[PDB]
Amino acid sequence: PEMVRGQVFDVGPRYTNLSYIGEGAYGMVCSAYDNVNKVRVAIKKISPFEHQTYCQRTLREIKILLRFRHENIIGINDIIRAPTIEQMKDVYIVQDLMETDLYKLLKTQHLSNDHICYFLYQILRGLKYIHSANVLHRDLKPSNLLLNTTCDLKICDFGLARVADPDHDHTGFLTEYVATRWYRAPEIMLNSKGYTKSIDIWSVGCILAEMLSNRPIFPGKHYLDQLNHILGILGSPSQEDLNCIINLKARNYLLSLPHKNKVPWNRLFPNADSKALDLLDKMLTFNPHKRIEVEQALAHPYLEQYYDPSDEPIAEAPFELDDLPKEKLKELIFEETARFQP
């Protein structure tokens, strides 16, 4: 079997001529030549079986992406694994190969207004589908937006995704959270577990701001610094928005801060289209109950050239893993991947 940078890739005979792309936590990504479809593909080797959290992330992604079918959401084309549970130490997820991602693109390229507009349209169009299946992505950020050479965009990384659960959203102040710090809505740090659709809209807002300037809007360096970056631009919450934070520790923290005025979007983004800033404002609303929803965002004047609800499809139906042992999760990954075996 082929080796890439000191790691076997047991993906043959179908997939050959491997080139390194990248790696991360307990897995590696290569491109490969698919000998059946005669195109290069992305393959990610996941070796999650020693840690229950890696098993969780793997199973969530697999179950969600096999159910989902949408042009702006990365699909799974194939899954390679050993024929038995005993022999299975790795899972290979085979996906369409994309040229780049929005994180990489933003570090090197100025985006025209038309590019920003089109990228945002695609983000929201994919997210409409996700939200219509009662699923939350929960880790939207530039590196999870894949792009091909014609700027078609696909949402990836569904390892932190959850079924929406707005009646169990409430928590205490400073509750620890997993998803990427810079894209966390203010309520995460105050009183929210991130179980409502509004958490994803906040993240899309952050992404839009980062497309406008090529810099993250709220680059917090640690948990509570994230909130203070947010409040540094949005300004002090209103009485009404404060009154919705019933937990006293969270309320009193906010009340303890000096008054801060709002930084106008058009001063932060002097070259931005004014309709883009109006939509930005609505996505980056402090109060999650007042924040724009995905279907409203699509209907906003900024996206008028693209908006077409008949061509923005929804899922055919809606969607416990948290307490399950790593070994029951291996069984479920094994079972969920059986359709790809001969």
Ligand SMILES: CC(C)(NC(=O)CN1Cc2ccc(-c3nc(NC4CCOCC4)ncc3Cl)cc2C1=O)c1ccccc1
């Ligand atoms: C922790 C875990 C399981 N997370 C993920 O799986 C999340 N991730 C990480 C990744 C990397 C690349 C591609 C990907 N990239 C491209 N093109 C490239 C060409 C070069 O510029 C950038 C884009 N085309 C298709 C795909 Cl699917 C997709 C993903 C994805 O969903 C993990 C497991 C293993 C390794 C790291 C983390």
